[PDB]
Design a protein around this ligand. Sequence first.
Ligand SMILES: Cc1cc2nc3c(=O)[nH]c(=O)nc-3n(C[C@H](O)[C@H](O)[C@H](O)COP(=O)(O)OP(=O)(O)OC[C@H]3O[C@@H](n4cnc5c(N)ncnc54)[C@H](O)[C@@H]3O)c2cc1C
Ligand SMILES: Cc1cc2nc3c(=O)[nH]c(=O)nc-3n(C[C@H](O)[C@H](O)[C@H](O)COP(=O)(O)OP(=O)(O)OC[C@H]3O[C@@H](n4cnc5c(N)ncnc54)[C@H](O)[C@@H]3O)c2cc1C
Lengths: 366, 366
Amino acid sequence: TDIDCIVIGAGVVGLAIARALAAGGHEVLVAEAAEGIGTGTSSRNSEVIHAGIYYPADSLKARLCVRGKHLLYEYCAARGVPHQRLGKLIVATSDAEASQLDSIARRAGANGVDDLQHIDGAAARRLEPALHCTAALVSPSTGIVDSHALMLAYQGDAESDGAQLVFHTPLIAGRVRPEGGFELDFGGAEPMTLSCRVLINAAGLHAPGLARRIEGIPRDSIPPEYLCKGSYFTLAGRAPFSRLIYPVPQHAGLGVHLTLDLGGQAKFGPDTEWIATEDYTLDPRRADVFYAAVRSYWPALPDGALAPGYTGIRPKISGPHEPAADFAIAGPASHGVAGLVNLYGIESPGLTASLAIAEETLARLA
Amino acid sequence: TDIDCIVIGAGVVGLAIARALAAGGHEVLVAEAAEGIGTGTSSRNSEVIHAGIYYPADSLKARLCVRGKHLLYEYCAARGVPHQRLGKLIVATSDAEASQLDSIARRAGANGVDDLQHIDGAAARRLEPALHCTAALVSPSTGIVDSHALMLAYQGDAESDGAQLVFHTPLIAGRVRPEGGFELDFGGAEPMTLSCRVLINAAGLHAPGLARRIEGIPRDSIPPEYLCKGSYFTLAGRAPFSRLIYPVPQHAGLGVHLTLDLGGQAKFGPDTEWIATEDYTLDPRRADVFYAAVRSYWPALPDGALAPGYTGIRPKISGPHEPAADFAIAGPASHGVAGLVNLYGIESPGLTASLAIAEETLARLA
Ligand SMILES: Cc1cc2nc3c(=O)[nH]c(=O)nc-3n(C[C@H](O)[C@H](O)[C@H](O)COP(=O)(O)OP(=O)(O)OC[C@H]3O[C@@H](n4cnc5c(N)ncnc54)[C@H](O)[C@@H]3O)c2cc1C
Ligand SMILES: Cc1cc2nc3c(=O)[nH]c(=O)nc-3n(C[C@H](O)[C@H](O)[C@H](O)COP(=O)(O)OP(=O)(O)OC[C@H]3O[C@@H](n4cnc5c(N)ncnc54)[C@H](O)[C@@H]3O)c2cc1C
């Protein structure tokens, strides 16, 4: 018999969607190619709860980041998911950069982020004794979250509403059925075929390629699949700052974020590296260029202190010389396929936006 | 513009093409994402020089395997590339399988493979004392090759004719210029954009995805990109057979090949496992089902003797329930794009066919 809804991918976004579908009374099967939940791009990010500052007005990134932030802070408090509203400084390290702050704060305001504080460098140093900057914007609503815990929590909720998750179960090929619904061929060690009424393609890095593997999805609707890797490095011995530090959006060349984990340890990154294949191997040498970038706002960074961290890969749907694409949530109104939502290019701030992306997917599926 | 011919991929097929274009007088640049040559599917295969036996009549696999074999044996002998014409038995392990051998031999003959010997089980045992079968076909032209040495030889040839190879240089995005030629965005330590007159996409597992990242290549022309992994297990010590041993194609369930390397060690596999992502991790549990399959023809396979080997992934352009697609060699006559050849689905016997694939690529380019 048909399963009602199949969600492909058990990342944070796939799980938020499964959770929403199951809460709506639908039978849900989540198929994940990996051996567990949240091993993918949901385990290789900064884990920052973003405020919604610099996304373009009315973009999905802007709307879903701000809505998602509110839903997520409430969810974390309600469910006891570890998180901290520790705040962030966007720091200007030259007079030219300091001049950029006013417009950045106005963009945030227009997105519904109305708590930014514009302060001078001396004020910023009062807040953060180790910090060297010309001026800053304080973003008090920016936080951090344990994304693994968040994933498990979404999973728990969905299961409580009858969802079933099946691991090491890769979707290989599918077809839109003439009569409606989908027929799906799964691979791995135990290949099998299942059919369903609703299909959610939340496959992340692989969503566009996977859509191309489903007969009946228009090929002109599917974006190209690019990969933009990011590497993080860690700092042993407890952090020099109590808030996240971000250079200005338009900072020239490499902008190194200083972020914090829940245990209080600082990490640096991610950088940007366009690559041809899905390769998570950490190149420790990529830290070399971090030093001068970080020392612009934290000159006390010691030599050799940037220890190997980890990598992630962003799902890109536009190329290295194009302006960044918005999130793509493609439902029947754009591709013409009843019962299908493809999600493409859910890079940052996808974790922050996750519960809002779930809302929007259901809205579009309708 | 910058560059006459650019070849994407330094696997055995990309190198054969680069060698042919350079020999034809073209300035050639080969761009490879990895650090050296042949680190892709060209490093994870059986290394068998196939005879041309079972491929569909008039297919590219049939024609290029047979032509390729003759060119390859000549090349190896002329240049000193290590190889062995060891021969192969196709073995029937039941009365029903034995009844299939005549039609297999007829197919081979139609493909231009005229040297198969149809013999009984006793005769087969005289050749291979450890074999248990009802009947067999001997394929004396089947062999094995040192594929790394082969690729180094191809590279040397191309370089002798002016070719340049650049590594850690992934092609990220590109576009077809309306006036002809291509503009290509490369990553790596120093990202750069280059233009060229001729573009050969020999990107293997990623060829279809890469084609989709080149604006101007008709999207309907580009097949889906599937991945079909295969696992191998090795046998420590003395090999039981002096020829390769293949069960008949229509063998029920898993057919396990027994092949030999140039050092005389036996290995078993590969199996078939359709997967979602490029993961080469060997799962030792996959050997469990090999035992019964191998024992159909080598019942003396000892308990526990299947040691972890390695895996490879086949580039597929048709799905698990479709007939195996032919090699894809997609020039201007098919997609309309001047100076472009895309190679897709170059799985086995692509190593054997490599020099013939290069011939066909140049023919189709022109
Ligand atoms: C370096 C980096 C830093 C980031 N930092 C932040 C941040 O600080 N704050 C923030 O809000 N966001 C951040 N993000 C974004 C956030 O990490 C992602 O938006 C989020 O994890 C995406 O989750 P997802 O479910 O869409 O994708 P994924 O976690 O990638 O899940 C997709 C799943 O699909 C599975 N899959 C793929 N193909 C198949 C198939 N054929 N069959 C079955 N399963 C399949 C995969 O195994 C995977 O588990 C960052 C992203 C990156 C890359
Ligand atoms: C398990 C297995 C066993 C096999 N056994 C046999 C056999 O016994 N006999 C036989 O004849 N054939 C066999 N084959 C087939 C043979 O291995 C292949 O046909 C051959 O290796 C393919 O070579 P290639 O150059 O097309 O691909 P590859 O070797 O995969 O080369 C593609 C190259 O492109 C590069 N690349 C990808 N994307 C980019 C990018 N965007 N930019 C720059 N570079 C990029 C990759 O890094 C890679 O090096 C086997 C195949 C498999 C999977």
